[PDB]
Amino acid sequence: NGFFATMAWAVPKNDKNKTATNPLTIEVPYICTEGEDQITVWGFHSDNETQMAKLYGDSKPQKFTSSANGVTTHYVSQIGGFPNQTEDGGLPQSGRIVV
Amino acid sequence: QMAKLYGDSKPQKFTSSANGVTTHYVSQIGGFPNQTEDGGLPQSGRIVV
Amino acid sequence: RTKIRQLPNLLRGYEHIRLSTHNVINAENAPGGPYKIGTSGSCPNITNG
Amino acid sequence: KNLQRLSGAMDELHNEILELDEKVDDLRADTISSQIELAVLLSNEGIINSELALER
Numbered sequence A: 001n002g003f004f005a006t007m008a009w010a011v012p013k014n015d016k017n018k019t020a021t022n023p024l025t026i027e028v029p030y031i032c033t034e035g036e037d038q039i040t041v042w043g044f045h046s047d048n049e050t051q052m053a054k055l056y057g058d059s060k061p062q063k064f065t066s067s068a069n070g071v072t073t074h075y076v077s078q079i080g081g082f083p084n085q086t087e088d089g090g091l092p093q094s095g096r097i098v099v
Numbered sequence B: 001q002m003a004k005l006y007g008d009s010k011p012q013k014f015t016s017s018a019n020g021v022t023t024h025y026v027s028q029i030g031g032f033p034n035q036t037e038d039g040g041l042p043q044s045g046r047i048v049v
Numbered sequence C: 001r002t003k004i005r006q007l008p009n010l011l012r013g014y015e016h017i018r019l020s021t022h023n024v025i026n027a028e029n030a031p032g033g034p035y036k037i038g039t040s041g042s043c044p045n046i047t048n049g
Numbered sequence D: 001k002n003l004q005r006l007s008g009a010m011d012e013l014h015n016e017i018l019e020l021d022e023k024v025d026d027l028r029a030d031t032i033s034s035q036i037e038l039a040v041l042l043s044n045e046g047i048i049n050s051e052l053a054l055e056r
């Protein structure tokens, strides 16, 4: 078990304070040099209705926003059955990923 | 301060639509960037325009 | 966090520009309950305050 | 004609459009230059070939 280098899959720790939150906001620092363009890769993950409540604290869909220098985008998750898996590594999973 | 001013702690959300051009925004609650290009007095809040 | 920075360069593009008169909407009567209108130091006016 | 920045451009937002602007500018300058060069070349040809009438 691994993942994309490009991003980290934030699963909230263990039972604890695991629950649904209102949108959290995050700044993405510049990190590159000089006159370089910095391309940031990010996304999200959904699952079975029961798996969702197992993983995170929440059954309902979750919502996402990216803003970088004038360009705004908005996304909202799918809960129930997704498209048949494709171009993937080959193991069956109940969830999918948007990037 | 949010609960003092308005009735609400959680983030608030906004939308503009003018002749084909749609935009969407959602607020930050906790700590913001250090103030800049401002009038010089320290405030806890910030503004999106 | 918005395109606001270019607003002057946009105005610039036109031959004729002018702030308006009056107001495109009454803030105090707007939807969501009567509003007091907020002001902040760092934004002084002809007087001050 | 003049070739100035187009007014709805916006450097941050629309770069691609902008790149195409650049393209159209460069292409213009090139073409018009060629045309001029031609006009001159022709003109010089005339000036030098004309140099035989006094004889007549």
Ligand SMILES: *[C@@H]1O[C@H](CO)[C@@H](O[C@@H]2O[C@H](CO)[C@@H](O[C@@H]3O[C@H](CO)[C@@H](O)[C@H](O)[C@@H]3O)[C@H](O)[C@H]2NC(C)=O)[C@H](O)[C@H]1NC(C)=O
Pocket (backbone or CB within 6 Å): A047, A048, A049, A050, A051, A093, A094, A095
């Ligand atoms: C997606 O959600 C479904 C339920 O909607 C989950 O189904 C569970 O799938 C596993 C694998 O097919 C089943 O486990 C197997 O069950 C049998 C009998 O209990 C046991 O003999 C095996 O050792 C194994 O555990 C499980 O029973 C089934 N659950 C139900 C309700 O049918 C699936 O796990 C979910 N995926 C994600 C990633 O959470």
Ligand SMILES: *[C@@H]1O[C@H](CO)[C@@H](O[C@@H]2O[C@H](CO)[C@@H](O[C@@H]3O[C@H](CO)[C@@H](O)[C@H](O)[C@@H]3O)[C@H](O)[C@H]2NC(C)=O)[C@H](O)[C@H]1NC(C)=O
Pocket (backbone or CB within 6 Å): B001, B043, B044, B045
């Ligand atoms: C932003 O929220 C913070 C709390 O998270 C607010 O902090 C409050 O800041 C003021 C100014 O530093 C503190 O007031 C001073 O307190 C001392 C002792 O009570 C008193 O001697 C002074 O006369 C003065 O009132 C206040 O105690 C502090 N609150 C806490 C919880 O530490 C700040 O006011 C917030 N800003 C906005 C715009 O609401």
Ligand SMILES: *[C@@H]1O[C@H](CO)[C@@H](O[C@@H]2O[C@H](CO)[C@@H](O)[C@H](O)[C@H]2NC(C)=O)[C@H](O)[C@H]1NC(C)=O
Pocket (backbone or CB within 6 Å): C045, C046, C047, C048, C049
């Ligand atoms: C400049 O600012 C002052 C306050 O710093 C404004 O005075 C306020 O006026 C409103 C009504 O217009 C009153 O409700 C407030 O009580 C006034 N404040 C104080 C403390 O006097 C003034 O109106 C501003 N000047 C202009 C013309 O905008």
Ligand SMILES: *[C@@H]1O[C@H](CO)[C@@H](O)[C@H](O)[C@H]1NC(C)=O
Pocket (backbone or CB within 6 Å): A083, A084
């Ligand atoms: C997905 O797989 C099932 C078999 O497990 C198949 O019946 C179904 O047609 C597939 N759906 C798609 C999108 O091809």
Ligand SMILES: *[C@@H]1O[C@H](CO)[C@@H](O)[C@H](O)[C@H]1NC(C)=O
Pocket (backbone or CB within 6 Å): B033, B034
């Ligand atoms: C903001 O100000 C504090 C000092 O009050 C300083 O320590 C911090 O580095 C500043 N942050 C930024 C973004 O410069």
